[PDB]
Design a protein around this nucleic acid. Structure first.
Lengths: 81, 50, 120, 44, 110
RNA sequence: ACCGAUAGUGAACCAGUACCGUGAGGGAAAGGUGAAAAGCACCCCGGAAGGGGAGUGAAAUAGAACCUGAAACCGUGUGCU
RNA sequence: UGAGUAGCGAAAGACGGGUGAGAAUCCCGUCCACCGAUUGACUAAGGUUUCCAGAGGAAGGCUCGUCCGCUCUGGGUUAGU
């Protein structure tokens, strides 16, 4: 469903970890069980593992928004976006 | 300890009479052509010829 | 007869370090107050190296420092081996006056007048 | 020496927190005064 | 006569005026050597203002450097920066960082 | 027959906000280029900052630390002493 | 005004290369010196991006600064135990 917001494109994500792991930006109210079902339905893949982590607002006078990025490991299939 | 009276301009300018800066000892270098401190080494060329 | 704003224990180590750095490089920069005292300290180490006796080779080891010079590469002759060797064979006929001081003017940030000391 | 203020995250919310000012009529009159004045922070 | 101004320098005016007396009224060739071999913190800054005034004399106008003399040289006070240093027993003492305005005038006396 | 930026509401500015206190509370300073941005293309000194020309405009001793610019205070030159 | 006066917060540094407009203070190397029931190695409270890389020197750093816990841009925290 509409739980994925933005793919992450960085040296840590794109140059490395991109062999089999894909990083995304998810809603701030979803668990790792809802990210596995959403990825398969949209990308037609089979997910093997899913890690998640939280990020706090950063002062920039005002603060940037908080983020939540998850990393999914697929057993079979490739996104190749 | 503390000053009883403030200092006036007339008195302040007389004390600073000898508070001057010195003019260095400089001469024209035989080979460089620029000015040089006596008994030193020409910065421009590097020759002393003692 | 100078103290150089240091204690007796530091005024001896700094002199041992300045004498060894010169024998290796043959030309160094320092202040004027340090150059006029290191002058007499280095001129006596060459006097010992011109006698050649083993007794003199052991008295020079009390002031010299253990430092290798790879430039020569012939076993990386120690600082003490350079003396009694390359340096002892140059001033054979010269009796005194193995150094020369040169002025350069004050240095920025400190006001101290830099000097150049080298072996003649 | 030891100074008067030693920070403590939990003790600061239990004594001056929002939920403790609402448990008392006098505490509620504190938030009504800060609201009437236009403060950006009400409690804590 | 050509002029050059260096505005809002971070050196105290009293310290800049000490070197301005050594060059006021001298020649444009002997004033550069004096400023160089001197060992004051205001020499490099004052020298860069005199080099831009001699360049203005031959580019905007056309005057040969051989006929250039230091006519006027003075320094004025600029805005100050108010800073505070902590003292003993909870006291504070104000500190001033003063600025200067350097002006140089070269002329050929003709 | 009220005030005109130390005045008038604490606040003509994004003010119950900078800041101060464990807390209940206490609390400021800050308006003005020009009729029109037409906000100095380009050359020169400099690492920059800054400055001297050129140009815009009625005016740049109107160049954003920008209407008018008093006194204290700090400098340079000079007639008499 | 006092006044270019007091002070600049416990302590060992020296030289040779490199960078650059500018080096006693930044980088690399070799000697020397200090702690070692410890100035070493892990972790609660508290702080809340001070962490990493490239690029900067107006202000802050009681001097300097090419450097920084300072400025700009982009990054960094993965648990069935």
């Amino acid at each position: 469903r509409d739980i994925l917001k933005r793919p992450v494109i960085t040296e840590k994500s794109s140059e490395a970890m991109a062999e089999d792991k894909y990083t995304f930006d998810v809603d701030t109210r979803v668990n790792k069980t809802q990210v596995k079902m959403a990825v398969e339905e949209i990308f037609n893949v089979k997910v093997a593992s899913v890690n998640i982590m939280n990020y706090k607002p950063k002062k920039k006078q005002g603060y940037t928004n908080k983020r939540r990025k998850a990393i999914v490991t697929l057993k079979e299939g490739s996104d190749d976006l | 300890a503390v000053p009883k009276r403030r200092t006036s301009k007339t008195r302040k300018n007389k004390r600073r009479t000898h508070f001057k800066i010195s003019v260095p000892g400089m001469t024209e270098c035989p080979n460089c052509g620029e000015y040089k401190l006596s008994h030193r080494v020409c910065k421009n060329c590097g020759s002393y010829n003692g | 007869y100078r103290k150089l704003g240091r204690t007796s224990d530091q005024r001896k180590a700094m002199l041992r370090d300045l004498a060894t750095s010169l024998i290796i490089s043959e030309r160094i920069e320092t202040t004027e107050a340090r150059a006029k005292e290191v002058r007499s300290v280095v001129e006596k180490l060459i006097t010992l190296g011109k006698k050649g006796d083993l007794a003199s080779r052991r008295n020079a080891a009390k002031t010299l420092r253990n430092v290798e010079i790879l430039n020569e590469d012939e076993t990386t002759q120690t600082a003490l081996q350079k003396l009694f060797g390359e340096i002892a064979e140059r001033y054979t006929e010269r009796q005194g006056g193995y150094t020369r001081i040169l002025k350069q003017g004050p240095r920025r940030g400190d006001g101290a007048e830099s000097v150049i000391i080298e072996l003649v | 020496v030891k100074r008067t203020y030693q920070p403590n995250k939990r003790k600061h919310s239990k004594v001056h927190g929002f939920r403790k000012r609402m448990s008392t009529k006098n505490g509620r009159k504190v938030l009504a005064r800060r609201r009437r004045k236009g403060r950006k922070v009400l409690s804590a | 006569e050509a002029k050059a101004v260096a505005r809002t320098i971070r050196i105290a005016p009293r310290k800049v005026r000490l070197v301005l007396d050594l060059i006021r009224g001298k020649n444009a060739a002997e004033a550069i050597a004096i400023l160089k071999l001197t060992n004051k913190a205001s020499s490099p800054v004052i020298e860069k203002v005199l080099m831009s005034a001699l360049a203005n004399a031959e580019h905007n106008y056309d005057m040969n450097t051989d006929e250039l003399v230091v006519k006027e040289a003075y320094a004025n006070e600029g805005p100050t920066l108010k800073r505070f240093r902590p003292r003993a027993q909870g006291r504070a003492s104000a500190i001033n960082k003063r600025t200067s305005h350097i002006t140089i005038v070269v002329s050929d006396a003709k």
